Amino acid sequence: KVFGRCELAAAMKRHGLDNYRGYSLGNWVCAAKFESNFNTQATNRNTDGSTDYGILQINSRWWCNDGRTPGSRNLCNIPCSALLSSDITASVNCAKKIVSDGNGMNAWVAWRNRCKGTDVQAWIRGCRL
Ligand SMILES: [Cl-]
Ligand SMILES: [Cl-]
Ligand SMILES: [Cl-]
Ligand SMILES: [Cl-]
Ligand SMILES: [Cl-]
Ligand code: NA
């Protein structure tokens, strides 16, 4: 599923991401835009053989099991394929664990390079929330 901007903002709000660990909703929408272009089916392979999955590009090196990342962890206790669903619940619940692990949203390279320090409120402007 390819979300619209305000559609995704509302879904992320319903799932408790607005101001989660202090990160306002626009941060999460901005991260999703630049990680996946709002596409739940996005995948990208990393140099070390791990793979990033879904709307927030969660990495199989630490967070999910895909059966092809030897020596990796599965800290969200899910198959990586569950992060590609049109229902974003699994991606949101895993992202909550990630952002709580001490480094905040710096875990998302695209957030750090394209959202951090910008006017992220613009990503939810005009949306009925
Ligand atoms: Cl957009
Ligand atoms: Cl915001
Ligand atoms: Cl594995
Ligand atoms: Cl949902
Ligand atoms: Cl933080
Ligand atoms: Na893994």
From Swiss-Prot:
Substrate binds at residue 101. One of its GO terms (molecular function) is identical protein binding. GO terms for cellular component: cytoplasm; endoplasmic reticulum; extracellular space. The active site is at 35, 52. It is found in: Secreted. Its EC number is 3.2.1.17. Gene3D superfamilies: 1.10.530.10. GO terms for biological process: cell wall macromolecule catabolic process; defense response to bacterium; defense response to Gram-negative bacterium; defense response to Gram-positive bacterium; killing of cells of another organism. Keywords: Allergen, Antimicrobial, Bacteriolytic enzyme, Disulfide bond, Glycosidase, Hydrolase, Secreted, Signal. Pfam families: Lys. InterPro entries: Glyco_hydro_22, Glyco_hydro_22_CS, Glyco_hydro_22_lys, Lysozyme-like_dom_sf. SUPFAM superfamilies: Lysozyme-like. PROSITE patterns: GLYCOSYL_HYDROL_F22_1, GLYCOSYL_HYDROL_F22_2. Lysozyme C is capable of both hydrolysis and transglycosylation; it also shows a slight esterase activity. It acts rapidly on both peptide-substituted and unsubstituted peptidoglycan, and slowly on chitin oligosaccharides. This is Lysozyme C. It comes from Gallus gallus (Chicken). The gene is LYZ.
